[PDB]
Amino acid sequence: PEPDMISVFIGTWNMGSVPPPKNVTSWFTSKGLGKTLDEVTVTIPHDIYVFGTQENSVGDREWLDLLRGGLKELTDLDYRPIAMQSLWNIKVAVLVKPEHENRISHVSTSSVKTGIANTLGNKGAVGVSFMFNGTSFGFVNCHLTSGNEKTARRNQNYLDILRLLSLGDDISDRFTHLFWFGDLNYRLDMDIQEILNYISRKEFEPLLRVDQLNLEREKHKVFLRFSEEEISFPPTYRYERGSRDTYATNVPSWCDRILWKSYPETHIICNSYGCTDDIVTSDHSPVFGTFEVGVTSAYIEFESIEAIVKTATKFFIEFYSTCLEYKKSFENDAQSSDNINFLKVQWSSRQLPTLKPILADIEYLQDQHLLLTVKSMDGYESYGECVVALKSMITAQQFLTFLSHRGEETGNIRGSMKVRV
């Protein structure tokens, strides 16, 4: 009866403060350049459409009506808005096929301004989250600091959004699938003429080697734990308005991006990632991404858990899951330190709780996830969280993962657990 997979469309477009054209068909249908949807059979009406825009001067009401009208003319379906959020001229909207409206719950929205001198809200982010049956989704649409030289400012904008957006403890591990897209504004570290030469040859690999987002991700400095699909479309900025023949330091760049972060052992596949070449009202080309995503419609026991945490003495663990009705441990009963500012802490089975899932079916349990948070006895401060999938843990089996807190890696965790049915 209920679906076990959905198709999600994500579109991002910096509209350049001018009216869009009446027809943006190519954007909605993943047609143009890059990884595209070419066949009739794969160009499907998606279950969820998410539209993120920047420099959007269309009124909220009017823009949503254009999206609803556009989807209706395209699909013959009356797509239902489930949420929308604007921050000044940064706007996101989520629309769902009518047959799925009953499956949506726990809708949330949020926005954050980023700036030192500027808090107008033309730089920042907007966010929307919800549950589709038992699977949660977060969508963040941003517009970060511009300029070739401002990489460090963009990385800080990212960190500030991650820490301050109140969707649904940062947002990193709040959702089964977190999509982050927009005008990220990362540029190419290369001279204008060399860039244009490579673009003429349709040779994108030499350019992608000097893309600042790729370099910063590779250096572990931003978008930790996010993935991006391979880019095979030309830079989406900066074009002359009225054609895509001519690019206008502001060298050509892939400013407009879609990235995702998913819970372990989930099903997610990127089916398209590209840009249009026939929408020409803005100095940016619209970018599309489509995804196939899995959705979901007994005693959990721990033999032991060991963690290494950054600290300069006693810690406990909180266990959280949507499949539970929340639970906690006693303090660690052992600790040691090979190195200064790191503490190895151990919890024997006596210190650890037994968790009780709501249903006992294997098909239900294999799709669930546990959130573990390590907190200090003194102050109840989080020193790190991680997510463990139950899919491979159903004898005792070992999990091994890493602790994160507010965008910093803060240690690791290893444990033995049993899921009995």
Residue numbers in the entry: 419 to 586, 593 to 672, 683 to 731, 746 to 760, 763 to 775, 777 to 845, 848 to 874
Article passage:
The SHIP Ptase domain belongs to a family of Mg2+-dependent inositol phosphatases with specificity for 5 P dephosphorylation of inositol rings. Here, we report the crystal structure of SHIP2 containing the 5-Ptase and a C2 domain (Ptase-C2), revealing that the two domains tightly associate via an extensive interface. Importantly, even in the absence of a localization effect, the C2 domain provides activating signals to the Ptase active site, resulting in a significant increase in catalytic turnover.
In order to disrupt the hydrophobic core of the domain interface we mutated F593 and L597 to aspartates (FLDD mutant). Crystal structures of Ptase-C2 FLDD confirm that few hydrophobic interactions remain intact between the Ptase and C2 domains. The FLDD mutations also disrupt interdomain hydrogen bonds between R649 and E862. When comparing the catalytic turnover of the FLDD mutants we find that the C2 domain no longer has a significant effect with either substrate, indicating that the FLDD mutations largely mimic the absence of the C2 domain. Removing the C2 domain abolishes observed SHIP2 activity, whereas the FLDD mutations partially reduce activity of the wild-type protein.
